[PDB]
């Protein structure tokens, strides 16, 4: 729609690049001179554009490699089977019927495994190609030289698709991974402050997105290893795995924010008057943690190295101040009258928030370690 | 491999059914008498078997309705466009190229909305059909009496696929949903015991499956409404949504077990000497909760109603005993010496573990209420 297009103007360009490739193919088809070989079977060239045109360059290269491997293997096996069938001379229609059963059984069985679950598009092309070659080459009997004219058009369609996809506003999966890693830091930094403000008041998509994107980052990393060097990523083998390592450390840090958010929806809650004692100490930690996460995200985005000053000094000091405050007023969290039930559970429930906050601060040193590793493997610019 | 056959023997029945349908079609094709139309185009029937065969029966009905809708809309638009194009006369190829560009842009833009992620297969059978009908019907001027003969072979392949799929050992999505719901209770029950035992030692897939398969239940629900009555689910409008409501309540209860597991991986851990004091109470709650979850899962499995006894009496008693114990020995969690850092946090972690366990026991009434509602909407039988 208008809103969807304006929000992400990329989709309009992708739709008009697909329309351009279809027009550039239909013009050749409709103006080509008559031929005895490609004047009736030319349709196989405009339907390849609709099947091999993906959203990124790396996806197009990898999927096209898989489809060409399946097609060439199915064609070689079908040619061998057809040549071998003639030996019997009287049960050809039975041998060719048993071949279909055997190959279809194995092709279906092998595509249901829990490992090759993302490559069913390459198994289906094998199953369609074996059947097409075996059935269409029975009456004619010379599909050897007819199967290459149907691959020449496929090659023309895939060449046009790749040229139009690559030389007109390409979309790179590496930049997608870079942008996603930059965006997760801001999502977590917003959620942490929303949780602290909601609890102290007299938050979902942040950690939801930061915890449910491991598959997306893995797929984007798989696509990114095919693309050639370009732009700022000037190196033969860029270290794309350190981006996944930094996102794993960030998710380990965001699981405590998810626990903090779940502390607000619980059935048992402490009285509002008791929460107001630790307001300043609770707010300072959220402020410093969000500042740190935004500073790390900004350094990642600009491809810059960490400065010489310690970044964790302020948050560490705030955590120590909160600990001392908790120690001073510890008698609010328990009752010494019984020292040797809803009210007691409520009173003890106010210390879970502070214990989880201190554990969140304790988990922040491994994100800095992973960032230093990434800033070293990939040559980041020296700070100004 | 071979072991996968024994683990799930129904994937070998699926592969053999696929081979059976392929060989029935190949046996009709290899023996059909010569005809003026089917002697050369009888390969469109065996290709449809490989496209419209699905694991379940409701997925086959739903995706064959989507595919037939796309094919017929595309064919009607293409024929009307060709007839309107002939009116222009000259520049007719300019008109056809413009039409192909506009339709390709629209069909590419409409399959990118985030509300249509699951129908990106019913949008791709419309652009192939439009381009096929427009390009192949230009050099003869007649493509209306041939498309009728090209659709009969498709309807024959789809009729054979559905007959063989539905009359030889069918698989039902409602049974898959029923079994998934029954297995979630077992997984959560095993995870709670694993977490408590691991904490008290001198777990992951359990809650992971329950909290990481929400879309699976909705996909099986979308397929299950298309299937006819059968077996014990003898009702035209089966409340398949109450299974989803029960799974949602169980997921809400599994989010606390996730945090109980996370307490073991923290960087701050309490001393074991203080841990040993609260051992019998923790184990009693850890066994009562698992026995209740396994009883609810068993009563869902056999479709039986709740008895006259109260299932939550024992867990409530164990929780009250744990709270009284915490109240007696509360002086070990806090220090009264400085009443008005690492050691204090380590001591305070015990209260977090106890509080999370108590919240787990406090959230079970929602699951019991959901089970009672499900056993009311569907006619569950009376106990014994
Ligand atoms: C109103 C009247 C309306 C009536 C309606 C009339 C019906 C109109 C019919 C239009 C049908 C045309 C649609 C296009 C066909 C469907 C495509 C499809 O669905 O499949 C997708 C399916 C899945 O695609 P993917 O998952 O995206 O990869 O596979 C395909 O892409 C198409 C493959 C077709 C099989 C071609 C096999 C060719 C043989 C190999 C070539 C020779 C190489 C061997 C070399 C020798 C080696 C030594
Ligand atoms: C009825 C027309 C059918 C046309 C089906 C086209 C499907 C093509 C699938 C094979 C893609 C091969 C990718 C390009 C390989 C290469 O360029 O060498
Ligand atoms: C040429 C390749 C074939 C591609 C087929 C894609 C379109 C599939 C449409 C399936 C509709 C089947 C209708 C069956 C009618 C019935 O038996 O009730």
Curated annotation (Swiss-Prot), chains A, B:
It comes from Arabidopsis thaliana. GO terms for molecular function: monoatomic anion channel activity. Its main location: membrane. Vacuolar malate channel. Has a higher selectivity for malate than for fumarate. Also exhibits a weak chloride conductance. Belongs to the aromatic acid exporter (TC 2.A.85) family. One of its GO terms (biological process) is malate transport. Keywords: Chloride, Ion channel, Ion transport, Membrane, Transmembrane, Transmembrane helix, Transport, Vacuole. This is Aluminum-activated malate transporter 9. The gene is ALMT9.
